[PDB]
mmCIF file of N, CA, C and O in Angstrom:
data_model
loop_
_atom_site.group_PDB
_atom_site.id
_atom_site.type_symbol
_atom_site.label_atom_id
_atom_site.label_comp_id
_atom_site.label_asym_id
_atom_site.label_seq_id
_atom_site.Cartn_x
_atom_site.Cartn_y
_atom_site.Cartn_z
ATOM 1 N N UNK A 1 0.827 -1.201 0.000
ATOM 2 C CA UNK A 1 0.000 0.000 0.000
ATOM 3 C C UNK A 1 0.865 1.257 0.000
ATOM 4 O O UNK A 1 1.826 1.361 0.764
ATOM 5 N N UNK A 2 0.519 2.207 -0.861
ATOM 6 C CA UNK A 2 1.265 3.457 -0.961
ATOM 7 C C UNK A 2 0.360 4.595 -1.423
ATOM 8 O O UNK A 2 -0.591 4.379 -2.175
ATOM 9 N N UNK A 3 0.664 5.805 -0.968
ATOM 10 C CA UNK A 3 -0.120 6.980 -1.337
ATOM 11 C C UNK A 3 0.730 7.979 -2.115
ATOM 12 O O UNK A 3 1.830 8.337 -1.690
ATOM 13 N N UNK A 4 0.217 8.423 -3.256
ATOM 14 C CA UNK A 4 0.928 9.380 -4.095
ATOM 15 C C UNK A 4 -0.024 10.442 -4.637
ATOM 16 O O UNK A 4 -1.244 10.284 -4.583
ATOM 17 N N UNK A 5 0.543 11.525 -5.161
ATOM 18 C CA UNK A 5 -0.256 12.613 -5.715
ATOM 19 C C UNK A 5 -0.651 12.316 -7.158
ATOM 20 O O UNK A 5 0.195 12.293 -8.053
ATOM 21 N N UNK A 6 -1.942 12.090 -7.378
ATOM 22 C CA UNK A 6 -2.451 11.795 -8.712
ATOM 23 C C UNK A 6 -3.257 12.966 -9.265
ATOM 24 O O UNK A 6 -4.390 13.205 -8.845
ATOM 25 N N UNK A 7 -2.666 13.691 -10.207
ATOM 26 C CA UNK A 7 -3.327 14.838 -10.818
ATOM 27 C C UNK A 7 -2.479 15.419 -11.946
ATOM 28 O O UNK A 7 -1.378 14.940 -12.217
ATOM 29 N N UNK A 8 -2.999 16.453 -12.597
ATOM 30 C CA UNK A 8 -2.289 17.100 -13.693
ATOM 31 C C UNK A 8 -2.687 18.567 -13.814
ATOM 32 O O UNK A 8 -3.870 18.906 -13.772
ATOM 33 N N UNK A 9 -1.692 19.435 -13.963
ATOM 34 C CA UNK A 9 -1.938 20.867 -14.087
ATOM 35 C C UNK A 9 -0.905 21.520 -14.999
ATOM 36 O O UNK A 9 0.217 21.034 -15.133
ATOM 37 N N UNK A 10 -1.294 22.626 -15.625
ATOM 38 C CA UNK A 10 -0.403 23.349 -16.527
ATOM 39 C C UNK A 10 0.306 24.483 -15.795
ATOM 40 O O UNK A 10 0.121 25.656 -16.119
ATOM 41 N N UNK A 11 1.121 24.127 -14.806
ATOM 42 C CA UNK A 11 1.846 25.127 -14.045
ATOM 43 C C UNK A 11 2.989 24.531 -13.247
ATOM 44 O O UNK A 11 3.739 23.697 -13.752
ATOM 45 N N UNK A 12 3.123 24.961 -11.997
ATOM 46 C CA UNK A 12 4.183 24.465 -11.127
ATOM 47 C C UNK A 12 3.986 22.984 -10.820
ATOM 48 O O UNK A 12 4.672 22.129 -11.377
ATOM 49 N N UNK A 13 3.045 22.689 -9.929
ATOM 50 C CA UNK A 13 2.759 21.312 -9.547
ATOM 51 C C UNK A 13 1.446 21.222 -8.775
ATOM 52 O O UNK A 13 1.263 21.894 -7.759
ATOM 53 N N UNK A 14 0.533 20.390 -9.265
ATOM 54 C CA UNK A 14 -0.763 20.211 -8.623
ATOM 55 C C UNK A 14 -0.636 19.351 -7.369
ATOM 56 O O UNK A 14 0.397 18.722 -7.137
ATOM 57 N N UNK A 15 -1.693 19.328 -6.564
ATOM 58 C CA UNK A 15 -1.701 18.545 -5.334
ATOM 59 C C UNK A 15 -2.980 17.723 -5.220
ATOM 60 O O UNK A 15 -4.080 18.271 -5.166
ATOM 61 N N UNK A 16 -2.828 16.402 -5.184
ATOM 62 C CA UNK A 16 -3.970 15.504 -5.078
ATOM 63 C C UNK A 16 -3.534 14.125 -4.588
ATOM 64 O O UNK A 16 -3.323 13.200 -5.372
ATOM 65 N N UNK A 17 -3.398 13.984 -3.262
ATOM 66 C CA UNK A 17 -2.987 12.722 -2.638
ATOM 67 C C UNK A 17 -4.065 11.648 -2.740
ATOM 68 O O UNK A 17 -5.163 11.805 -2.208
ATOM 69 N N UNK A 18 -3.742 10.557 -3.428
ATOM 70 C CA UNK A 18 -4.683 9.456 -3.597
ATOM 71 C C UNK A 18 -3.978 8.111 -3.456
ATOM 72 O O UNK A 18 -2.906 7.900 -4.023
ATOM 73 N N UNK A 19 -4.586 7.205 -2.697
ATOM 74 C CA UNK A 19 -4.014 5.882 -2.480
ATOM 75 C C UNK A 19 -4.091 5.042 -3.751
ATOM 76 O O UNK A 19 -5.127 4.995 -4.415
ATOM 77 N N UNK A 20 -2.989 4.379 -4.085
ATOM 78 C CA UNK A 20 -2.930 3.542 -5.277
ATOM 79 C C UNK A 20 -3.662 2.223 -5.050
ATOM 80 O O UNK A 20 -3.847 1.772 -3.919
ATOM 81 N N UNK A 21 -4.089 1.586 -6.152
ATOM 82 C CA UNK A 21 -4.806 0.309 -6.100
ATOM 83 C C UNK A 21 -3.908 -0.843 -5.663
ATOM 84 O O UNK A 21 -2.711 -0.661 -5.444
ATOM 85 N N UNK A 22 -4.494 -2.029 -5.539
ATOM 86 C CA UNK A 22 -3.746 -3.212 -5.131
ATOM 87 C C UNK A 22 -2.922 -3.768 -6.287
ATOM 88 O O UNK A 22 -3.035 -4.944 -6.633
ATOM 89 N N UNK A 23 -2.097 -2.914 -6.884
ATOM 90 C CA UNK A 23 -1.254 -3.320 -8.001
ATOM 91 C C UNK A 23 -0.057 -2.386 -8.149
ATOM 92 O O UNK A 23 1.054 -2.827 -8.447
ATOM 93 N N UNK A 24 -0.289 -1.096 -7.936
ATOM 94 C CA UNK A 24 0.771 -0.100 -8.044
ATOM 95 C C UNK A 24 1.564 0.001 -6.745
ATOM 96 O O UNK A 24 1.018 -0.182 -5.657
ATOM 97 N N UNK A 25 2.854 0.294 -6.868
ATOM 98 C CA UNK A 25 3.722 0.423 -5.704
ATOM 99 C C UNK A 25 4.816 1.456 -5.947
ATOM 100 O O UNK A 25 5.916 1.350 -5.402
ATOM 101 N N UNK A 26 4.509 2.455 -6.766
ATOM 102 C CA UNK A 26 5.468 3.507 -7.083
ATOM 103 C C UNK A 26 4.755 4.760 -7.584
ATOM 104 O O UNK A 26 3.685 4.682 -8.186
ATOM 105 N N UNK A 27 5.359 5.916 -7.331
ATOM 106 C CA UNK A 27 4.786 7.188 -7.755
ATOM 107 C C UNK A 27 5.532 7.744 -8.965
ATOM 108 O O UNK A 27 6.761 7.719 -9.015
ATOM 109 N N UNK A 28 4.778 8.246 -9.938
ATOM 110 C CA UNK A 28 5.367 8.810 -11.147
ATOM 111 C C UNK A 28 5.035 10.293 -11.273
ATOM 112 O O UNK A 28 3.928 10.723 -10.943
ATOM 113 N N UNK A 29 5.999 11.073 -11.752
ATOM 114 C CA UNK A 29 5.809 12.508 -11.920
ATOM 115 C C UNK A 29 6.562 13.023 -13.142
ATOM 116 O O UNK A 29 7.793 13.058 -13.156
ATOM 117 N N UNK A 30 5.815 13.424 -14.166
ATOM 118 C CA UNK A 30 6.411 13.937 -15.392
ATOM 119 C C UNK A 30 6.246 15.448 -15.494
ATOM 120 O O UNK A 30 5.168 15.943 -15.825
ATOM 121 N N UNK A 31 7.319 16.178 -15.208
ATOM 122 C CA UNK A 31 7.292 17.633 -15.267
ATOM 123 C C UNK A 31 7.849 18.135 -16.596
ATOM 124 O O UNK A 31 9.062 18.139 -16.812
ATOM 125 N N UNK A 32 6.955 18.557 -17.485
ATOM 126 C CA UNK A 32 7.357 19.059 -18.793
ATOM 127 C C UNK A 32 7.543 20.571 -18.769
ATOM 128 O O UNK A 32 7.038 21.254 -17.878
ATOM 129 N N UNK A 33 8.270 21.089 -19.752
ATOM 130 C CA UNK A 33 8.524 22.521 -19.843
ATOM 131 C C UNK A 33 8.418 23.004 -21.286
ATOM 132 O O UNK A 33 9.307 22.761 -22.101
ATOM 133 N N UNK A 34 7.323 23.690 -21.595
ATOM 134 C CA UNK A 34 7.097 24.206 -22.939
ATOM 135 C C UNK A 34 7.745 25.576 -23.113
ATOM 136 O O UNK A 34 8.678 25.740 -23.900
ATOM 137 N N UNK A 35 7.245 26.559 -22.371
ATOM 138 C CA UNK A 35 7.773 27.915 -22.443
ATOM 139 C C UNK A 35 8.210 28.408 -21.067
ATOM 140 O O UNK A 35 7.820 27.864 -20.033
ATOM 141 N N UNK A 36 9.039 29.462 -21.052
ATOM 142 C CA UNK A 36 9.547 30.051 -19.809
ATOM 143 C C UNK A 36 8.457 30.773 -19.022
ATOM 144 O O UNK A 36 8.696 31.272 -17.922
ATOM 145 N N UNK A 37 7.257 30.824 -19.593
ATOM 146 C CA UNK A 37 6.130 31.484 -18.945
ATOM 147 C C UNK A 37 4.988 30.505 -18.696
ATOM 148 O O UNK A 37 4.004 30.840 -18.037
ATOM 149 N N UNK A 38 5.126 29.294 -19.228
ATOM 150 C CA UNK A 38 4.104 28.268 -19.064
ATOM 151 C C UNK A 38 4.735 26.880 -18.995
ATOM 152 O O UNK A 38 5.607 26.543 -19.796
ATOM 153 N N UNK A 39 4.289 26.080 -18.032
ATOM 154 C CA UNK A 39 4.810 24.728 -17.860
ATOM 155 C C UNK A 39 3.674 23.730 -17.652
ATOM 156 O O UNK A 39 2.519 24.118 -17.472
ATOM 157 N N UNK A 40 4.009 22.445 -17.680
ATOM 158 C CA UNK A 40 3.019 21.391 -17.494
ATOM 159 C C UNK A 40 3.562 20.289 -16.592
ATOM 160 O O UNK A 40 4.748 19.963 -16.635
ATOM 161 N N UNK A 41 2.685 19.715 -15.773
ATOM 162 C CA UNK A 41 3.075 18.646 -14.862
ATOM 163 C C UNK A 41 2.014 17.552 -14.811
ATOM 164 O O UNK A 41 0.827 17.816 -15.001
ATOM 165 N N UNK A 42 2.451 16.324 -14.551
ATOM 166 C CA UNK A 42 1.539 15.188 -14.478
ATOM 167 C C UNK A 42 2.030 14.162 -13.462
ATOM 168 O O UNK A 42 3.195 13.763 -13.478
ATOM 169 N N UNK A 43 1.134 13.738 -12.578
ATOM 170 C CA UNK A 43 1.472 12.758 -11.553
ATOM 171 C C UNK A 43 0.388 11.690 -11.443
ATOM 172 O O UNK A 43 -0.798 11.978 -11.597
ATOM 173 N N UNK A 44 0.804 10.456 -11.174
ATOM 174 C CA UNK A 44 -0.131 9.345 -11.045
ATOM 175 C C UNK A 44 0.541 8.141 -10.391
ATOM 176 O O UNK A 44 1.730 8.177 -10.073
ATOM 177 N N UNK A 45 -0.227 7.077 -10.195
ATOM 178 C CA UNK A 45 0.291 5.861 -9.580
ATOM 179 C C UNK A 45 0.602 4.806 -10.638
ATOM 180 O O UNK A 45 -0.269 4.410 -11.411
ATOM 181 N N UNK A 46 1.852 4.353 -10.664
ATOM 182 C CA UNK A 46 2.278 3.343 -11.625
ATOM 183 C C UNK A 46 3.142 2.279 -10.957
ATOM 184 O O UNK A 46 3.811 2.527 -9.953
ATOM 185 N N UNK A 47 3.131 1.064 -11.525
ATOM 186 C CA UNK A 47 3.909 -0.063 -11.002
ATOM 187 C C UNK A 47 5.408 0.125 -11.205
ATOM 188 O O UNK A 47 6.202 -0.123 -10.296
ATOM 189 N N UNK A 48 5.789 0.563 -12.399
ATOM 190 C CA UNK A 48 7.194 0.783 -12.720
ATOM 191 C C UNK A 48 7.388 2.126 -13.420
ATOM 192 O O UNK A 48 6.741 2.412 -14.428
ATOM 193 N N UNK A 49 8.283 2.946 -12.878
ATOM 194 C CA UNK A 49 8.562 4.257 -13.448
ATOM 195 C C UNK A 49 10.053 4.421 -13.732
ATOM 196 O O UNK A 49 10.891 4.188 -12.860
ATOM 197 N N UNK A 50 10.377 4.823 -14.956
ATOM 198 C CA UNK A 50 11.765 5.018 -15.356
ATOM 199 C C UNK A 50 12.108 6.503 -15.427
ATOM 200 O O UNK A 50 11.237 7.340 -15.658
ATOM 201 N N UNK A 51 13.383 6.821 -15.226
ATOM 202 C CA UNK A 51 13.841 8.205 -15.266
ATOM 203 C C UNK A 51 14.152 8.634 -16.696
ATOM 204 O O UNK A 51 14.955 8.002 -17.386
ATOM 205 N N UNK A 52 13.512 9.712 -17.138
ATOM 206 C CA UNK A 52 13.718 10.225 -18.487
ATOM 207 C C UNK A 52 14.886 11.204 -18.529
ATOM 208 O O UNK A 52 14.771 12.342 -18.077
ATOM 209 N N UNK A 53 16.010 10.753 -19.077
ATOM 210 C CA UNK A 53 17.199 11.591 -19.181
ATOM 211 C C UNK A 53 17.419 12.057 -20.615
ATOM 212 O O UNK A 53 17.290 11.278 -21.560
ATOM 213 N N UNK A 54 17.753 13.334 -20.772
ATOM 214 C CA UNK A 54 17.988 13.906 -22.092
ATOM 215 C C UNK A 54 19.080 14.971 -22.037
ATOM 216 O O UNK A 54 18.941 15.984 -21.351
ATOM 217 N N UNK A 55 20.165 14.734 -22.765
ATOM 218 C CA UNK A 55 21.282 15.673 -22.802
ATOM 219 C C UNK A 55 22.220 15.355 -23.962
ATOM 220 O O UNK A 55 23.297 14.794 -23.767
ATOM 221 N N UNK A 56 21.802 15.718 -25.171
ATOM 222 C CA UNK A 56 22.616 15.464 -26.345
ATOM 223 C C UNK A 56 22.016 16.050 -27.606
ATOM 224 O O UNK A 56 22.548 17.007 -28.169
ATOM 225 N N UNK A 57 20.904 15.477 -28.053
ATOM 226 C CA UNK A 57 20.232 15.946 -29.259
ATOM 227 C C UNK A 57 18.728 16.065 -29.033
ATOM 228 O O UNK A 57 18.081 16.975 -29.551
ATOM 229 N N UNK A 58 18.178 15.138 -28.254
ATOM 230 C CA UNK A 58 16.750 15.135 -27.961
ATOM 231 C C UNK A 58 16.382 16.294 -27.039
ATOM 232 O O UNK A 58 17.255 16.959 -26.480
ATOM 233 N N UNK A 59 15.083 16.529 -26.883
ATOM 234 C CA UNK A 59 14.598 17.605 -26.027
ATOM 235 C C UNK A 59 14.745 17.238 -24.554
ATOM 236 O O UNK A 59 14.264 16.194 -24.113
ATOM 237 N N UNK A 60 15.413 18.104 -23.797
ATOM 238 C CA UNK A 60 15.623 17.871 -22.373
ATOM 239 C C UNK A 60 14.741 18.793 -21.537
ATOM 240 O O UNK A 60 15.088 19.147 -20.410
ATOM 241 N N UNK A 61 13.599 19.179 -22.096
ATOM 242 C CA UNK A 61 12.668 20.060 -21.401
ATOM 243 C C UNK A 61 11.671 19.258 -20.571
ATOM 244 O O UNK A 61 10.640 19.781 -20.146
ATOM 245 N N UNK A 62 11.982 17.986 -20.345
ATOM 246 C CA UNK A 62 11.112 17.111 -19.569
ATOM 247 C C UNK A 62 11.927 16.218 -18.639
ATOM 248 O O UNK A 62 12.996 15.729 -19.006
ATOM 249 N N UNK A 63 11.415 16.008 -17.430
ATOM 250 C CA UNK A 63 12.095 15.175 -16.446
ATOM 251 C C UNK A 63 11.094 14.380 -15.615
ATOM 252 O O UNK A 63 10.312 14.949 -14.852
ATOM 253 N N UNK A 64 11.125 13.059 -15.764
ATOM 254 C CA UNK A 64 10.221 12.185 -15.027
ATOM 255 C C UNK A 64 10.876 11.666 -13.752
ATOM 256 O O UNK A 64 11.967 11.098 -13.790
ATOM 257 N N UNK A 65 10.202 11.864 -12.623
ATOM 258 C CA UNK A 65 10.722 11.417 -11.336
ATOM 259 C C UNK A 65 9.915 10.236 -10.805
ATOM 260 O O UNK A 65 8.718 10.119 -11.067
ATOM 261 N N UNK A 66 10.580 9.362 -10.057
ATOM 262 C CA UNK A 66 9.927 8.189 -9.488
ATOM 263 C C UNK A 66 10.343 7.987 -8.034
ATOM 264 O O UNK A 66 11.488 8.246 -7.661
ATOM 265 N N UNK A 67 9.405 7.522 -7.215
ATOM 266 C CA UNK A 67 9.671 7.285 -5.801
ATOM 267 C C UNK A 67 8.696 6.260 -5.229
ATOM 268 O O UNK A 67 7.725 5.880 -5.883
ATOM 269 N N UNK A 68 8.964 5.817 -4.005
ATOM 270 C CA UNK A 68 8.111 4.835 -3.345
ATOM 271 C C UNK A 68 7.684 5.326 -1.965
ATOM 272 O O UNK A 68 7.162 4.558 -1.156
ATOM 273 N N UNK A 69 7.911 6.608 -1.702
ATOM 274 C CA UNK A 69 7.553 7.200 -0.419
ATOM 275 C C UNK A 69 6.192 7.884 -0.495
ATOM 276 O O UNK A 69 5.829 8.456 -1.522
ATOM 277 N N UNK A 70 5.443 7.818 0.601
ATOM 278 C CA UNK A 70 4.121 8.433 0.661
ATOM 279 C C UNK A 70 4.197 9.919 0.328
ATOM 280 O O UNK A 70 5.020 10.649 0.883
ATOM 281 N N UNK A 71 3.335 10.363 -0.581
ATOM 282 C CA UNK A 71 3.305 11.763 -0.988
ATOM 283 C C UNK A 71 4.702 12.254 -1.352
ATOM 284 O O UNK A 71 5.039 13.418 -1.132
ATOM 285 N N UNK A 72 5.511 11.361 -1.912
ATOM 286 C CA UNK A 72 6.871 11.703 -2.308
ATOM 287 C C UNK A 72 6.867 12.730 -3.438
ATOM 288 O O UNK A 72 7.788 13.536 -3.561
ATOM 289 N N UNK A 73 5.823 12.693 -4.259
ATOM 290 C CA UNK A 73 5.699 13.619 -5.379
ATOM 291 C C UNK A 73 4.883 14.846 -4.982
ATOM 292 O O UNK A 73 4.267 15.495 -5.826
ATOM 293 N N UNK A 74 4.884 15.157 -3.689
ATOM 294 C CA UNK A 74 4.141 16.304 -3.202
ATOM 295 C C UNK A 74 4.919 17.599 -3.339
ATOM 296 O O UNK A 74 5.913 17.659 -4.061
#
């Protein structure tokens, strides 16, 4: 059992603590960056979350974080 913030907003970071189902055991958070005046964020409960790294040719305006701590993505 684990609790994470499940929501999505076009700004800094939304807040919505919700307990994951009897299958998920990790928190995912994808913070995207479109413009210097507008950003987007997304959080939810997932079983497996990988870290999105970009530093070469692809767009590095996005960074996905993963954790297993309660409200870790708060």
